[PDB]
Every structure is written in C-alpha cells, then in structure tokens.
C-alpha cells in the first residue's frame, strides 16, 4: 500500500519497504518518488555544490539494496553520456530543471552517437532509466538556476561507462561521492 511520503525521511522509510525483497516494482518506486514534494529544508544538508562540476552526495545506503543520493548541478553542469551498470536508475528533480538526452547503445563501428530524444525534467518529476531503455546524458542547461536531483540506483553501483559522442567508444569511470550522510568526503 503506497502512501504519500510526508518528508524525505518518510520517503526513505518507504523505500526501505519497497526494496525489502529481491525485485523492484519500478512504477511503484517512481510513483512514490514523484509523490514526495521536495522540501529544501529536508535536504539542505546534502546539497553541497562544487563550482566546476556536479557533485554526488550520498543520502542513504538502503539495505545494501540501493544507493539514494542527491546530485547538485551548477549552472551549465552536466554529465557524460553514460549507462547504469545493469541497475535501475530513478532521477527525481528536487530543484530546478534538467535536460535528459537519450541515446541508443552504439554499434561496434566508430560512429557519431545521435540523440534519440530529449526532454526537460521539471521540479518534482521523476524519470527512470535502465540499460534496456538506452544511455543518457543529464544536463543543467540553465544559466541562472542550480538544479538538485534525487537519484536512486538499485542495485548500487560505483562504476559506469562514459561514451564518446563522436565515436560511441566507452570508458569505465569510477563514481566518487562528494559527501556521505552530510559529511564532506574528500
Ligand atoms: Fe544516469
């Protein structure tokens, strides 16, 4: 029985319930994430920005069944084109807007990766991606407004691939956390 999360803490409690088992009801998880109304006071602790690139701030480690983190995107900050390491990935906007661009998995041939689609993710909206859907890039294209997003990955992963848009070639990257549970982790 899915109820509206009253607070971020309440959302986290609900997520522990939704991930108690071995599988993932994606539509239910997405619905609960969307239903949480972002309250900046509840997540200010995690919203640690860096001037030069977006930061990943760990919020909850789940049951070891998911990583829940907050990403802080300065004006103009964006990600690589990347995959999600055979995991579910939910992305909910807490503040601002992000542009998501979708790409197909490349062929062996070196070739320009052409976008398949793009969309604008707005405050409180939750998006979902997995490797079967494709690859994506996420960017804060705003010149004036930082963006903050809440990401849930299951199972947790600490590596993924970045793809070179000009060729489709991939390289493995290790994800690092800017902070964990509100504590800067240099
Ligand atoms: Fe992603």
Whether the CB-CB separation of 50 and 148 falls below 8 Å is answered with no
Judged by DSSP in three states, 131 sits in coil
- The DSSP code sequence of 138-150 is EE---SS--EEEE
Distance (Å, whole) CA 87 – CA 157: 8
Cis peptide before 155 (omega within 30 of 0): yes
Give the CATH number of the domain where residue 140 resides: 2.60.120.10
Distance (Å, whole) CA 11 – CA 185: 24
Solving technique: X-ray
**161 a known binding residue?**
no
**143 a known binding residue?**
no
Dmax over CA atoms of the chain, in Å, equals: 49
Whether the CB-CB separation of 13 and 7 falls below 8 Å is answered with no
Q: In the chain, how many domains are there?
A: 1
Residue with tokens 């990935």: 89
Distance (Å, whole) CA 44 – CA 42: 6
Whether the CB-CB separation of 82 and 161 falls below 8 Å is answered with yes
CA atoms within 13 A on the CB side of 107: 5
Distance (Å, whole) CA 10 – CA 4: 9
Radius of gyration over alpha carbons of the chain, in Å? 16
> Which residues are within 8 A (CB) of 96 and not within 5 positions of it... i.e. 6 or more apart?
73, 123, 140, 142, 145, 146, 147, 148
Quoted resolution (Å): 1.6
Distance of CA 85 from the midpoint of ligand 1 (Å): 10
Distance of CA 100 from the midpoint of ligand 1 (Å): 9
Distance of CA 36 from the midpoint of ligand 1 (Å): 20
Whether the CB-CB separation of 73 and 59 falls below 8 Å is answered with no
175 is in which domain, residue-wise? Answer: 1-186
Distance (Å, whole) CA 160 – CA 148: 21
**77 a known binding residue?**
no
């Amino acid at each position: 029985e899915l109820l509206k999360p009253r607070t971020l803490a309440d959302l986290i409690r609900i997520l522990h319930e939704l991930f108690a088992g071995d599988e993932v009801n994606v539509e239910e998880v997405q619905a609960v994430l969307e239903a949480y109304e972002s309250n900046p006071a509840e997540w200010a602790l995690y919203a640690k920005f860096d001037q030069y690139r977006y930061t990943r701030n760990l919020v909850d480690q789940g049951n070891g069944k998911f990583n829940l983190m907050i990403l802080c995107w300065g004006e103009g900050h964006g990600s690589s084109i990347h995959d999600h390491t055979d995991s579910h990935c939910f992305l909910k906007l807490l503040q601002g807007n992000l542009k998501e661009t979708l790409f197909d998995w490349p062929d062996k041939k070196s070739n320009e990766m052409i976008k398949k689609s793009e969309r604008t993710l707005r405050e409180n909206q939750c998006a979902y991606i997995n490797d079967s859907i494709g690859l994506h890039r996420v960017e804060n294209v705003s010149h004036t407004e930082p963006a903050v997003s809440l990401h849930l990955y299951s199972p947790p992963f600490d590596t993924c691939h970045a793809f070179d848009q000009r060729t489709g070639h991939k390289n493995k990257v290790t994800m690092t956390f800017h902070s964990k549970f509100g504590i800067r982790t240099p």
